[PDB]
Design a protein around this nucleic acid. Structure first.
Ligand SMILES: [Mg+2]
Ligand SMILES: [Mg+2]
Ligand SMILES: [Mg+2]
Ligand SMILES: [Mg+2]
Ligand SMILES: [Mg+2]
Ligand SMILES: [Zn+2]
Lengths: 114, 68, 84, 100, 177
RNA sequence: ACGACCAGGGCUACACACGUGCUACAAUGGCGCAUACAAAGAGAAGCGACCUCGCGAGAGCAAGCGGACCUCAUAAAGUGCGUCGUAGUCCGGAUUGGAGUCUGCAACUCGACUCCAUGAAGUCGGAAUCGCUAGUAAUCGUGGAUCAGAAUGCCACGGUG
């Protein structure tokens, strides 16, 4: 229901609910809840306090909250001031993984303006 | 000073990677950690300290154990 | 990405002239053509002029620049937009 | 192609013949070994500055009659136009038109 | 603070044996430190002003004074009475705390720092320098930052000429290039 | 010098428009478990088994095979069970950040692939326009040429139909 992570988990299932917290996906959720020793198909409903407190112990071992957003912002800022190729691509909203820019660069450029 | 119009101003702890620790009054609200301080700077000391124990150049060294 | 086991790739000519520089300090911004090499911590000190196709852009190396290649800090395509 | 590119490719072939032997034994084996002498394998990576052309990766398969860098076939060593006009005269054994 | 104690024992004696002062009231001392952020672009959006003044409240523990235009200038489309800048005057204990905080933590934060100039002495003994970004101070955490901004730092001294000002600052471990 | 050699760059850019494809917008589906049926092809500076290591891409050791013998090589749709129950979702995977592996003298521009993390548009598409008459359309996998490495392209093969 409520976890130490600011993100509040949805009632349906457990592995999917864990994925709702930003920074934890399927495998980390698979590893965390299997370290909890609980069946994976249980909901947060039909569940007591004695499991989500154990989940708070295990999730806190991974660095997963909006503090992870601070890391990615600081990593992005490392590429900005570095004067690297990735920073000028991050500066102009261009793709940085070497994708083609002549066409099919919408997901970076954004919808075209006239 | 006016009473309520100013921000909170507390004495806290500042910790540097070279280990020098300072008791500084500020508005951070909690203890904070400095990767570089005034003793930790090549310019002031003229010595260019190499203690990057918690650092990135060190990651580059353990990663590739290249010799001189 | 270099395979780690092979280790960082450097140009022997660049390594030789940068150690001559690192001993006698900064005399001039030494220029080079090898943009494919990484920058070593020992070379983190001098100013390196990387060739970008026609000129040699001088880029002073910082501590965060270590590990990254030289050619990341030398742009080759001049783009200032489309309507100017 | 031009005579310069055929002269350029022969050179690469020739150099590779000499260093093909030199390289794999000393350099590649040392670079891949698990013992991995940190000092000595590092030394030979700096030592991998022999002529670039002596690399077998620099060889471009050109047609042995014309020098076409495209449309190559490793079965015949020729380009696409050359293998078609050589097969049409029956100058290649067992090569007839396919139909199934 | 720390440098106020450090001033009163070491700095006063290190200066009167150097300039041969006859009175201890003759030595240079610092009046105030003025931090001036001129936002300028506030006329387009004044909520930006509400951010930038708050950064001064993050830097020093003092609510800043929102300065006005003082006159109508057509070169910048501002009129007289428009709030355009923020200024904090630091005196006393808060000045000394902020001065140690700047010398110890902030000034060893500028990238590729290679010594600030001794040429900027105002010609009577007051020092002035200009920071370009606010994230050199440890209180400014960048994820909540709207825009990086510059900051004027003005050191006001009791010096009569510039050499007394540079000798007062250089006794406090000032990084003069 | 419009000839020749070399290093680096570019042919990969990007306010845009078009063609051809891949992936989707989901429940005739996604996901997890167990399990079934191919054809065709390639291989010696090559195909590389078994075993061990690593979550994995891969690494180490190391046979057999110039091949109806060995290898690539476990076909997938399908079948049975369980869950998700119409949501921008257990859909979709774009993008991005960290950590990697291989090849190659060298993966910054400008390779492929793996792991973790984020989870964009998109909910069936206007005028208009394309292909197809049967093992065809539609769909699902497989191989090869080119090739050190680099296929959603191309050239072939079978399954359902
Ligand atoms: Mg000719
Ligand atoms: Mg080639
Ligand atoms: Mg092209
Ligand atoms: Mg729906
Ligand atoms: Mg078919
Ligand atoms: Zn320090």
């Amino acid at each position: 229901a409520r976890i130490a992570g600011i993100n509040i988990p949805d009632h349906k299932h457990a592995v999917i609910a864990l994925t709702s917290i930003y920074g934890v996906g399927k495998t980390r959720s698979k590893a965390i809840l299997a370290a909890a020793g609980i069946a994976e198909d249980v909901k947060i409903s039909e569940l007591s306090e004695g499991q989500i407190d154990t989940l708070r112990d295990e999730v806190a071992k991974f660095v997963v909250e909006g503090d992870l957003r601070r890391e990615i912002s600081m990593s992005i800022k490392r590429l900005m001031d570095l004067g690297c190729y990735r920073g000028l691509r991050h500066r102009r909203g261009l793709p940085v993984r070497g994708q083609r820019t002549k066409t099919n660069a919408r997901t970076r450029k954004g919808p075209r303006k006239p | 000073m006016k009473k309520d119009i100013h921000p909170k101003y507390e004495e806290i702890t500042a910790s540097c990677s070279c280990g020098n620790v300072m008791k500084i009054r500020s508005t951070v609200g909690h203890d904070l950690n400095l990767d570089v301080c005034s003793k930790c700077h090549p310019f002031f000391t003229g010595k260019q300290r190499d203690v990057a124990t918690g650092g990135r150049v060190d990651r580059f060294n353990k990663r590739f154990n290249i010799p001189g | 990405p270099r395979s780690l086991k092979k280790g960082p790739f450097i140009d022997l000519h660049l390594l030789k002239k940068v150690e001559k520089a690192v001993e006698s300090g900064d005399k001039k911004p030494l220029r080079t053509w090898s943009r494919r090499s990484t920058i070593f911590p020992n070379m983190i000190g001098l100013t390196i002029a990387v060739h970008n196709g026609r000129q040699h852009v001088p880029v002073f190396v910082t501590d965060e620049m270590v590990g990254h290649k030289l050619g990341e800090f030398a742009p080759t395509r001049t783009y200032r937009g489309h309507a100017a | 192609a031009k005579q310069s590119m055929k002269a350029r490719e022969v050179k690469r072939v020739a150099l590779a013949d000499k260093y093909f032997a030199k390289r794999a034994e000393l350099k590649a084996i040392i670079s891949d070994v698990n013992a991995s002498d940190e000092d000595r394998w590092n030394a030979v990576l700096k030592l991998q500055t022999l002529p670039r052309d002596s690399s077998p990766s620099r060889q471009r398969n050109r047609c042995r009659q014309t020098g076409r860098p495209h449309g190559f076939l490793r079965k015949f060593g020729l380009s696409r136009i050359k293998v078609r006009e050589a097969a049409m005269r029956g100058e290649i054994p067992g090569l007839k038109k396919a139909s199934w | 603070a720390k440098l106020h104690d450090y001033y009163k024992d070491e700095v006063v004696k290190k200066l009167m044996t150097e300039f041969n002062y006859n009175s201890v009231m003759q030595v240079p001392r610092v009046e105030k430190i003025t931090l001036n952020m001129g936002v300028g672009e506030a006329i387009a959006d004044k909520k930006l002003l509400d951010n930038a003044a708050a950064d001064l409240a993050a830097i020093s523990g003092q609510k800043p004074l929102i300065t006005k235009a003082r006159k109508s200038v057509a070169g910048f489309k501002i009129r007289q009475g428009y709030p355009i800048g923020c200024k904090v005057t630091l005196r006393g204990e808060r000045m000394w705390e902020f001065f140690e905080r700047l010398i110890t933590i902030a000034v060893p934060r500028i990238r590729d720092f290679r010594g600030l100039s001794a040429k900027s002495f105002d010609g009577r003994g007051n020092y002035s320098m200009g920071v370009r970004e606010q994230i050199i101070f440890p209180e400014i955490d960048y994820d909540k930052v709207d825009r990086v901004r510059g900051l004027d730092i003005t050191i006001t001294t009791t010096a009569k000429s510039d050499e007394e000002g540079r000798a007062l600052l250089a006794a406090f471990d000032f990084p003069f290039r």
